[PDB]
Amino acid sequence: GMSQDLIRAAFEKRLSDWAKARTPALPVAWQNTKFTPPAAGVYLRAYVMPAATISRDAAGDHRQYRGVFQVNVVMPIGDGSRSAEQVAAELDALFPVNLVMQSGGLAVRVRTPISNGQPTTGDADHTVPISLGYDVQFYPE
């Protein structure tokens, strides 16, 4: 891996470390990766969504390699299991609107503030909509 991998290696450096630093210590299911068993039916599916153009351009200097990142906080219906909120709020504390993390390539920056919403319920779980945007710099060396 080159350039691109450095990007995502910033995302993991903080988020995986947060997942294990946490007291319930959650599995951290990334792209092409699997994590199982859950933490007792609590787990975190975390989809990074880069930009992917159609390529073909007329110089080699442009763009911001921007994207979104999307997590699904799933927790079991133990009755009165509302933990979606706790997780949204702990991740809010971890993700400020400046989001200063330097990958080994560039810097990356959230742009947007944190967002959350109501869940849609599940078969024995619920799931809340949580995401932010992100961009990638090209400052000179």
Decide: residue 92, CB within 10 A, 0-12 exposed, 13-18 middle, 19+ buried.
middle
Both tokens of 34, joined, read: 């699997």
Number of C-beta neighbours around residue 25 at 10 A: 11
Q: From residue 65, how far is each of 60, 62, 91, 104, 126 by CA, in Å? A: 13, 9, 23, 15, 32
Closest CA to 112 of 98, 100, 102: 98
Query: Contact 76/41 with Cβ under 8 angstroms?
Result: yes
Using what technique was this structure determined? Answer: NMR
Closest CA to 25 of 38, 11, 34: 38
Both tokens of 53, joined, read: 């153009």
- Domains identified in the chain and CATH numbers: 1-141 (3.30.2000.20)
Both tokens of 138, joined, read: 């090209």
Amino acid at 53: T
Both tokens of 27, joined, read: 């599995």
| DSSP sequence for 61-77 | ------EEEEEEEEEE-
Decide: residue 26, CB within 10 A, 0-12 exposed, 13-18 middle, 19+ buried.
buried
| DSSP sequence for the chain | --THHHHHHHHHHHHHHHHHHSSS---EE-TT----S-BTTBEEEEEEE--------SSS------EEEEEEEEEE-SSS--THHHHHHHHHHH--TT--EE-SSSEEE--S--B-------SSEEEEEEEEEEEE-----
Chain centroid to Cα 70, Å, comes to 5
Amino acid at 123: D
What is the phi-psi region of residue 66: left when phi exceeds 0, alpha when psi lies from -120 to 50, beta otherwise? beta
